[PDB]
Design a protein around this ligand. Structure first.
Ligand SMILES: N[C@@H](Cc1c[nH]c[nH+]1)C(=O)O
Ligand SMILES: N[C@@H](Cc1c[nH]c[nH+]1)C(=O)O
Lengths: 147, 147
């Protein structure tokens, strides 16, 4: 569960993360008292996990984004690739997947040449083959849907 | 054009999108008014595209997430898929991509049976073939990195 007043809160907070403790409660139909603690029981139980401004990556010098699909070389060692790559900072996301490959990483980087670098790093640090797919344009990116 | 100070503001706003302007100000060493101004310029050049709560998709009922790569049934028409798929709510992101396929979507849904239904709506509304890669587990996502 997660009641149906908690939904209007999460719908509201996903389109507007600065969305103002007061303004919420009008279209939420309630008191600033009630809201501030739903919004807090919602973070306790892990339902909203954080608040983030959406930074444009081109604008901050990330001119190439790639999905990078990786598979470990040696199935005899502990498969721990996510924890091994976790310190590499250009890896923005790391998913395990049912497909040809074990994990899919989304990765951001200064230039085509910088990707060649990040990939040699990804391979020597986890012990993986890489297969990568270059993003040409992001049309829209996390529109969260609350059913 | 992004100086040392704008760098500090988008990093803080990335880690905490509900950062109050006074916490931002006493962190860049400026007045709460210089901070407001800068945050507004940041928003209207295109560096900060908005603010969102990171909602946990399992908690609101999306127990299955998938990457679906889509390629045109006839590719001579200028390309359409993103616009026509914008109105499918369960499509969370849409990137065009170099290689054999044209766009990759990240999609989220209630179940196996529901994925099967979304694939139909996708094939039909964008007139596209689809290759699905089910996500088994997300280890970390959205870690935005400001260099
Ligand atoms: N083609 C990928 C799936 C994918 C996700 N994003 C891009 N591609 C795999 O090898 O598993
Ligand atoms: N799929 C094409 C590029 C493309 C993007 N959208 C449609 N087509 C390629 O890899 O060369």
């Amino acid at each position: 569960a997660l009641d149906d007043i908690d939904r209007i809160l999460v719908r509201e907070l996903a389109a507007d993360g600065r969305a103002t403790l007061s303004e919420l409660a009008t279209r939420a139909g309630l008191s600033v008292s009630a809201v501030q603690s739903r919004v807090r029981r919602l973070e306790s139980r892990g339902v909203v996990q954080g608040y983030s401004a959406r930074i444009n990556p081109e604008a901050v010098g990330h001119l190439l984004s790639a999905f990078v699909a990786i598979t470990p070389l040696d199935p005899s060692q502990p498969d721990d690739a996510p924890a091994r790559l976790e310190h590499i900072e250009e890896v923005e996301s790391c998913y395990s997947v049912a497909g040809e490959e074990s994990y899919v990483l989304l990765v951001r980087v200064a230039s085509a040449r910088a990707l060649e670098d990040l990939l040699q790093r990804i391979r020597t640090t986890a012990n993986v083959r890489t297969r990568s797919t270059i993003i040409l344009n992001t049309f829209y990116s996390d529109r969260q849907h609350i059913p």
